[PDB]
Amino acid sequence: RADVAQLTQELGTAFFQQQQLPAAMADTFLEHLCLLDIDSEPVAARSTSIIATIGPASRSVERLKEMIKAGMNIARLNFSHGSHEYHAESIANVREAVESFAGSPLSYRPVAIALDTKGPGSGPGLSEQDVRDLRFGVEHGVDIVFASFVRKASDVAAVRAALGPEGHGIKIISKIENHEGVKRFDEILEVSDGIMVARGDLGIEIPAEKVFLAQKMMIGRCNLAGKPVVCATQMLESMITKPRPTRAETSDVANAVLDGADCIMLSGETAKGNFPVEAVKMQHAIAREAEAAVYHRQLFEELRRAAPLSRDPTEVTAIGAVEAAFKCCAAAIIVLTTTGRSAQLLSRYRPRAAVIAVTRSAQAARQVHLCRGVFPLLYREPPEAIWADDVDRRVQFGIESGKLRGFLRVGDLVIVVTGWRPGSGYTNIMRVLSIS
Template sequence: MRTKIIATLGPASMKYDIMKGMVEHGVRVFRLNFSHSDAQAFMPVVADIRRLEVETGIRLTIMGDLCGPKIRIGEVENSPLQINKGQRVLLGLPKYDAEAAGRTFVSLDVPELLEGLGEGDAVFLADGMLRFTVTEVIHPDALFEMRATTEGLLTSHKGIAFPDKIHPLPALTDKDRKDLREGIQLGIDAVALSFVQTADDVYEIKSLIREHGSSIPVVAKLERKRAVENLDSIVEAADAVMVARGDLGVECSLTTLPVIQKRIIRACRHKQKAVIVATQMMLSMVNNPGPTRAEATDVGNAVMDGADCVMLSEETAIGSYPVETCAYIQGIAQNCEPYYLERLGGPYRPSAEKNIVKYLAYSACLVAEHAESAALVSHSTSGSTARVLSSRRPSLPIYALSPDEGALRMLNFFWGVEPRLADRALSSHLERAIAFVRGEASIASGQSVVITSGQAHPPGQTETKTNTIKLFYK
């Protein structure tokens, strides 16, 4: 299985045996959702994950997911309320509650989000299940009348979204800053940043990470319409990207979401950045022992689009069948990946750009396939060579060697990559790679592998870069 599974931990899965079962079915990244807890509460499960690594011999990655500025409404009188299509309600700052005069009043104590709201603008509540259109500006930037265009239940403290507006709020909240600091102290291997809108959001959290003496990678969650508009610069800034289809499907029309997903996946592969497809992958399995046909097809399409990872949320956090859900994902991926590779007809050829690193990776994939090699083996301290190899989508497994544990755990996000710790007793990258091949049981005697490694650099150059491709027979 080349596609990686990210599983969110929660009450249904924060048990050692459950986590072990998920790992056996392809989970390589565990997500800790800081929206519902804090670092101290996660301490026992982090210890269990590290113990699970030792028992299974499989390197596992812990991703802390920051809450971000999720905007919620205040108390709704007589909640829950049935809202009918065409019904008029008021939206405004809490101080205007008295002007409701018996009408339903939705309070929002975030003045910045109401600035510039005008007639005809859309307002979504409850993750888009309730939709309204502004019909009258009663007090500019403060109180509005809205007409419901859908019907459903309105309850207190639900999320609110303004699809047509650019949000002035920063991606990092005070809670996020605290959770980031404590998460790094706890030992998380990566952090997911919610509600990213620009590359500056990513650079800001990277600066904070450095201030805390760490270098963990940043996963940029694309949940805003503005983030899609700034896709290229965000992909450039981030280490990985998440297609967070829940809020993104509220901000953007659902009719455009499938194409947006494909564009994001393609942009990430071109930049050798991991891409995660998330939200409602197998939501029905929260309560049912099997997915719907549509869910199975959705997961399969994400795999055949070339996603590096698929992420499970409620399915593993609160669902009744966390291990079974992972098993279904694994089975779908194992059936879809051969078709995906067949359709590619060989590794991706680099575009017309002059990029020697991509061409070296592409050449290594071609040599390995024509030689009918058992695997590709790459050695690099940062893991960058393995990431480029992964972006070419070879049909062979990629064994990525590095002496750096952080780099290895980052590589769990990448398609087809199996991270391995390099033998630090050997100084040469090539020697380390050959030693790994000789000791790897999955590579039989007489089989070949293609090794990519860095050799002696020119005088004056301090960084050793990948510049060697070697066909090696065990």
Template sequence: MQKQTKIVGTISNLRLDRDFLSGLIRAGVNVLRLNTAHQSPQELAEAVDTIRAVDDRVAILVDTKGPEIRVSSGGEPVEATVGRPIHLKGDPEGLSGGDRLYVNLPGFGARVPLGASILIDDGELELVVTAKDGETLTCFPQSDGLIKLRKSVNIPSVPFDLPSVSERDREFIRVASEKGVEFIAHSFVRCAEDVLAVRRLVEQHGGVARVIAKIENQEGVDHIDRILDHAYGVMVARGDLGIEIPEERVPAVQRMILQKCIESSKPVIVATQMLHTMIENPRPTRAEISDVAGAIYGETDAVMLSGETAYGKYPEEAVGTMTRIASEVERHLRPFRDHKLQRVDYVVTETLARSTVGASVHIKPRAIIVDTLTGRTARYVAAYRGRVPIFAMCYRRSVARQLQLTYGVQPYFMEMRSSREEFLQYAVSLLLDEGQLQHRDMVMVIGGSFGPSEGATFLEISQVSKILSSRVRHER
């Protein structure tokens, strides 16, 4: 089933067999996500090798843990009871137990003010700070429960000076870079420097990965414009975001980030609990269907599945459901998003992209074919959110896979051609062979100089048969 919106599917080393991966891809997954929170570096390397052996066209996104605060790993779980105080301190070597709870950030207590809410395990338990004695906090639970070791700790609206990249993340970034993955999604991005720190590590290890900034806290929201100056794309990670900011604000923040990313031609992913009930059930709730549809009506580049595909009972069904929702909603979207792009490097290319999508509303071609060295031209065209499929002819396999995350783009790898005529001949012949075009179809082609890239410089509109008749078909 054809769709424009891309799907990111999370997988784990527990399910990495060929049939499972092939099934997800057939159902509509474009990007496979690996969550390093549940992997070792060796398992990451093995997973990348397995995916490449199954399908070398699908993109791989590696998700880091990022800078975070957690309950320390030593000791035993702490029983939380309403009315009984818990004494909390920052000490990664501390042993939790009884009424003592330790977190992995030294000096934690000194930075948390009286009256602050401390949320444990993605907000499942709330502790309110009522007193401070040096670096030890006296907190009262707001509900009964068990605080387990290594669970997440969030303090809404209280900033902490954490390192951009942990030592653990550095090792995973090294492995991901050496394996040539397409994307690194860095967690808890707070500012542009967090993105730049990951980019420097990727370059240091000779990688091609593009950095996706996961927006999960108020600092990330506040600095979104500077983050967009340096990130390849953004993930709206609504789980932690809904803990760090009031949950009723999440829809408005999601909408704002989508708008900024689209006008910057930066891929944007909406994530977290989109079809959560399909972890256990074969059908989603109506609210979940509306949630996915809302993101697609907002013209997101991609929607993401987490537990639904990583360990759920109905992974292919979840992907199929998302594919059907996308295909239906896209029928009702406007055929041209006429807006001014931001962060434009090549004005001529951007002008050609806008003109092409605008004209496609009236010409109604079967396809827009794009010659792209870095993927930029294809992303410019996609930013105008037309209904016509965009076939991106790429000269690097890494670029072709990176475009798997961009709305409406179907990437193909080809060798560089020496002239416009050779490019046109080869591109339409390839798409004919793939069943994407027929001889009578009209196509719009955006191309460049076929040398050192200066962006796209021409637009051609023609029928496939006329392109082929202009020269004997190039032998591939």
């Protein structure tokens, strides 16, 4: 009680009853579980991104606007089905629905476009259809590739080569779907931007009762590496035909978030099912409850103990910023980023504070949805003559957007993360600011 007494008097007892804060202050994981309360309402914005598969049930512009409002952050196009013409029309409809909210940063919501490959099939490596689909992805400006059946590091090098010189910025998320992918996980993660636990094929390739071990191991290793991990397949399966999920399905979504997944996915639930919008809404509601139930006290301690020492100033600033945010219950960490990297390094420490990433790159704003707790703000103003003024203006844009969108309130403390010179790679400053 003495460690939270002054802040309880200042912020109030109602503040410390919400977002599972009594469970968050527990001294053991067992006590943390005992203190979880169904009446402790989540307050923070939902941090785990939702990937929705686009298909016949979720293709129209009107339906896509509803899905964006329900919480869809990434639109997945499964190239195992449909044609290039079909998927190009789906991409155009996603972009039209996204741009319908472009009138202001308060309404605008970047949505990433991910291409999920058909896979190698019976062949030992990159198929000819995958080469054509990957070229289609580059030509249509996709942000992410979910590479099917990645079994070794050379599979991801082949996907990278097939994206060519114009697709260097596309994120490659390797799908682990069989025994070989699980056994060679370390070499695959090393060369990938992230991982997808593709439980559909994994549950057929290895005994079904072992999938949870592979999921927990891969999520843990991605969390340790600071790289995005997606939990996928049959999360809310019964919602393909029913308006409400089973007890096992809500438990599965909550446990994927508690395991440490950066993203959760919907496949048949959004692509063909009768309730695509409701499936997104259900994942949104469960993820916010589960994020508040994360035991940050142990998680942050373990991420520090396991992470090696670093001489990279972005990494050093990120841990100092997350430590400062926890000390004052900061409402947000505002970070300036060109490629999304400074926001990714804050996200790896799993702050409770929202990471508001201010960027001029439309592609980086879409791709940062892969990192838990990163809320992208696309800045469109032309650069100021004095660089320091341009930096200040972007921070103020973050603060004003934050207040207008309810993330920030007068009296809140925010942590601001910036660098000492222009260009990517120079983040080295952390500032504590009081919102007025």
